[PDB]
Enzyme design. Sequence first.
Site, PDB file in Angstrom:
ATOM      1  N   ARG A 123       0.835  -1.198   0.000  1.00 45.95           N
ATOM      2  CA  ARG A 123       0.000   0.000   0.000  1.00 45.95           C
ATOM      3  C   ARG A 123       0.870   1.248   0.000  1.00 45.95           C
ATOM      4  NH1 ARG A 123      -2.860   3.089   4.487  1.00 45.95           N
ATOM      5  NH2 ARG A 123      -3.951   4.513   3.011  1.00 45.95           N
ATOM      6  N   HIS A 169      -3.280  11.011  -0.114  1.00 45.06           N
ATOM      7  CA  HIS A 169      -2.726  10.908   1.224  1.00 45.06           C
ATOM      8  C   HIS A 169      -2.025  12.197   1.642  1.00 45.06           C
ATOM      9  CE1 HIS A 169      -1.301   7.534   4.165  1.00 45.06           C
ATOM     10  NE2 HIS A 169      -1.049   8.720   4.760  1.00 45.06           N
ATOM     11  N   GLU A 191      -8.076   8.722   5.549  1.00 41.38           N
ATOM     12  CA  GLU A 191      -8.428   9.312   6.842  1.00 41.38           C
ATOM     13  C   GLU A 191      -9.060  10.696   6.680  1.00 41.38           C
ATOM     14  OE1 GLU A 191      -5.125   8.886   9.540  1.00 41.38           O
ATOM     15  OE2 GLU A 191      -5.071   6.738   9.258  1.00 41.38           O
ATOM     16  N   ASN A 206      -7.814   2.054   9.386  1.00 41.43           N
ATOM     17  CA  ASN A 206      -6.540   2.378  10.032  1.00 41.43           C
ATOM     18  C   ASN A 206      -6.795   2.445  11.543  1.00 41.43           C
ATOM     19  OD1 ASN A 206      -5.745   2.638   7.357  1.00 41.43           O
ATOM     20  ND2 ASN A 206      -5.111   4.819   7.490  1.00 41.43           N
ATOM     21  N   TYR A 248      -5.166   2.043  15.598  1.00 45.21           N
ATOM     22  CA  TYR A 248      -3.948   2.169  16.400  1.00 45.21           C
ATOM     23  C   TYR A 248      -4.171   1.979  17.907  1.00 45.21           C
ATOM     24  CZ  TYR A 248      -1.461   3.729  12.260  1.00 45.21           C
ATOM     25  OH  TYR A 248      -0.910   3.787  11.046  1.00 45.21           O
ATOM     26  N   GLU A 290      -3.816   0.033   7.786  1.00 46.38           N
ATOM     27  CA  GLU A 290      -2.748   0.455   8.672  1.00 46.38           C
ATOM     28  C   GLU A 290      -2.959  -0.080  10.075  1.00 46.38           C
ATOM     29  OE1 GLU A 290      -1.972   4.653   8.804  1.00 46.38           O
ATOM     30  OE2 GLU A 290      -2.212   4.875   6.550  1.00 46.38           O
TER      31      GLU A 290
END
Length: 445
Positions: free
Chosen positions: A76, A120, A165, A292, A294, A351
């Site tokens: 990616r 991005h 995002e 994504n 985290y 991610e």
Amino acid sequence: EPHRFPPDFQWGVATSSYQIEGAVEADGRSPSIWDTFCARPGAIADGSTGAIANDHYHRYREDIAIMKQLGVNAYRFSIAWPRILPDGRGRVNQAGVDFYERLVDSLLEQGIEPYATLYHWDMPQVQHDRTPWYDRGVVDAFVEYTDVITRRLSDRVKYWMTLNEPWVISFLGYGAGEHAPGLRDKELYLRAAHHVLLAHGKAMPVIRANGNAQTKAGIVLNLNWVNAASDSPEDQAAARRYDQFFNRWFAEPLYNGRYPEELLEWYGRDLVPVQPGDFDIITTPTDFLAVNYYARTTVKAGSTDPMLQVDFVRPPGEYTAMDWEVYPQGLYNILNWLHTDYAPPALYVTENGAAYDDQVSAAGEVDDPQRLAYLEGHFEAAYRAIQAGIPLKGYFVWSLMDNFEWGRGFEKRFGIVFVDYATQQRIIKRSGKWFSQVTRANGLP
Ligand SMILES: OC[C@H]1O[C@@H](O[C@H]2[C@H](O)[C@@H](O)[C@H](O)O[C@@H]2CO)[C@H](O)[C@@H](O)[C@@H]1O
Ligand SMILES: OC[C@H]1O[C@@H](O)[C@H](O)[C@@H](O)[C@@H]1O
């Protein structure tokens, strides 16, 4: 009972153009909003810029050989709008397209499937001057960029992601002033958020028309597991607002044609520039939803954030060097919510990863046991999600290599490959050597 993934599971690593490529002036590329913003004092914690970064623009072939060592079957990356359309619109920069042609050709020759992110965060500065995200004109500018690059690459790139995002683009860029272009205004944020969703939705038909029947496209959302600090009715209300703000603000428009109603009321509903037919565009069917993930974010009633009237609490536990709580159960929770509420035909983790302090040993090794445990715990959450019937089709580690971590600069290292910036030497980390065996075994030992 080695806990084994589906036979066609996609294992990858992820990067972005501005974070790795460097060569910011090479081959007709014009400045991005991030080349501009890095000049602002206070914007980047170590005072750095992405001018050189990992020099991946020149070194992509060597990085692709590293990907072969890691055993990934997917990569990616993002495409830099400033290399493709340096004036933002109009005249195509052939030398820019040709970089991505060489990159994709080299990936496919090594048996690595390209997953291309269109936006991005690196809009050309000259384009931002005309159409900031808060300006509805941004949408057709983004669709034009999309049209140009998908016409050239869609014979070789089957997997496409529209924007990375929305929450970051709109809130960090225009609402908190942390990210380019560095503005701080509730209305601008909400306008930018809306035009990001609309850019996604108008790009979707263009991606499909420029491709074939195998073409797959969708958006990338950051989502964290949100938790109330206590059982008090005002901690619960504070957590709910934060979850609406972070997690539901884009998902609800994408699947249900609506913004979270009580947050919209709280903000001032008229600040969102909804025109008739906009929800019909935003809800255009996708092939997948990319996530994504985290951390867990724990929230109480307070006034640290005056816009939302919440404070962040840090529960006792393990934290990365970003000060993010390690909470792998959160990934299962997020994936299961999305499955039950929205039923995406496919999910990808595009991610997931961790920044810890890394050092090269006497022997030339990078021993990162905390990063490896972070990844192990999260892969386990993903395995459980699949066993529960969630259609998770792949998992991309953030990141291939240490890179420019935005407002943190180069001080925060997310790679499973270490980069010695003095020489551009790559060293596969212990976590990367472990990953090398996960990909090949298609599972955890
Ligand atoms: O979690 C709140 C925290 O978010 C930070 O931005 C992160 C975000 O958490 C993550 O989901 C996304 O993928 O990346 C962004 C950028 O690193 C933000 O920097 C903080 O101000 C905020 O309190
Ligand atoms: O902060 C870790 C990572 O989080 C995500 O917001 C982005 O897609 C990456 O570019 C970033 O470095």
